[PDB]
Ligand binder design. Sequence first.
Ligand SMILES: CC(=O)N[C@@H]1[C@@H](O)[C@H](O[C@@H]2O[C@H](CO)[C@@H](O[C@@H]3O[C@H](CO)[C@@H](O)[C@H](O)[C@H]3NC(C)=O)[C@H](O)[C@H]2NC(C)=O)[C@@H](CO)O[C@H]1O
Ligand SMILES: CC(=O)N[C@@H]1[C@@H](O)[C@H](O[C@@H]2O[C@H](CO)[C@@H](O[C@@H]3O[C@H](CO)[C@@H](O)[C@H](O)[C@H]3NC(C)=O)[C@H](O)[C@H]2NC(C)=O)[C@@H](CO)O[C@H]1O
Ligand SMILES: [Cl-]
Ligand code: NA
Ligand SMILES: [Zn+2]
Length: 285
Amino acid sequence: KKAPIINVYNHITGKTEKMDMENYLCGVLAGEMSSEFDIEALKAQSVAARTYVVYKQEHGKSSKHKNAVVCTDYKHCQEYKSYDTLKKLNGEEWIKNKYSKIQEAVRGTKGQIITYNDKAILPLYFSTSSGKTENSEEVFSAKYPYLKSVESPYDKYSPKFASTLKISNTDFVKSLRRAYSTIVIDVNNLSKQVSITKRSDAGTVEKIKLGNKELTGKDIRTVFKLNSANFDIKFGEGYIDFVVKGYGHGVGMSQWGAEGMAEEGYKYYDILSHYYTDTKIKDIY
Ligand SMILES: CC(=O)N[C@@H]1[C@@H](O)[C@H](O[C@@H]2O[C@H](CO)[C@@H](O[C@@H]3O[C@H](CO)[C@@H](O)[C@H](O)[C@H]3NC(C)=O)[C@H](O)[C@H]2NC(C)=O)[C@@H](CO)O[C@H]1O
Ligand SMILES: CC(=O)N[C@@H]1[C@@H](O)[C@H](O[C@@H]2O[C@H](CO)[C@@H](O[C@@H]3O[C@H](CO)[C@@H](O)[C@H](O)[C@H]3NC(C)=O)[C@H](O)[C@H]2NC(C)=O)[C@@H](CO)O[C@H]1O
Ligand SMILES: [Cl-]
Ligand code: NA
Ligand SMILES: [Zn+2]
């Protein structure tokens, strides 16, 4: 049969809209990747995005949006940019010359999903790793045979591979106190009170001690708007520097990694089987 119609929760308007898969995936790709990425990277992303929807259909309904399979918020499911949005933001020439490449990538992989033992997988993906992807359980909760840590040697060419942020000691404690009212921390000798308790081999900070509090790397990323939870802290006179690696949760497929592999000659099946361990590709329509 033809492309299914899905229920998408638009987090901005607050309404559930019906959309055709293909048209929806064009919007996902437009927001997740640049039209300037290699066709093989875009194709890999389109398969993951499609697989994400299929995976959610087969599993339990979400707490956030129970009437919708996926939503338009990259913080919950994946990014989305409608045709009108992109038209007003980029123009008619862009739609005809660049967006066309996105549509071609989506139709290029029509009905294709990533599978583990013939079922659709949870195809998590993110911008840039630190050099290795993360095992699902070390970042989230559960262990999956296909979300394992693998090398990602082209990530170092990403503009988002490294970043640093300086925060005064004062603002460091002020931000923590505003977010955690029970925190007992002193602006002097932060180096004696702040320390990383547990970190994965890939580098995601799982636990970090701040005074009397134990937070996760994600918690820190959130409070200070860092690109990732893979960071180290260096204490200076009057400030702290966060030295961050990568951008995004680090599990599954690296978008800049895929771009790097594609630039080196790899095709979308090999990109997808490299990041999603022991998987295959299946055409469901
Ligand atoms: C394409 C992509 O990677 N999108 C990202 C989202 O997947 C991600 O949402 C978070 O996803 C993980 C994995 O699905 C969720 O973890 C699950 O949490 C539940 C309950 O807490 C637990 O039962 C599951 O075992 C656990 N899954 C795993 C694999 O361990 C997590 O709850 C989602 N977070 C939120 C806030 O909804 C978001 C946010 O990280 O980013 C997208 O880019
Ligand atoms: C006309 C034109 O293309 N102008 C450029 C903009 O497209 C560009 O916007 C940014 O594009 C990138 C895609 O490479 C977006 O990155 C993605 O962001 C989402 C979260 O929204 C995240 O899930 C993805 O991991 C991430 N992808 C990658 C590969 O890192 C980024 O959000 C876009 N920002 C926007 C739309 O505000 C800007 C960026 O400066 O440059 C124009 O020249
Ligand atoms: Cl499709
Ligand atoms: Na197909
Ligand atoms: Zn969602």
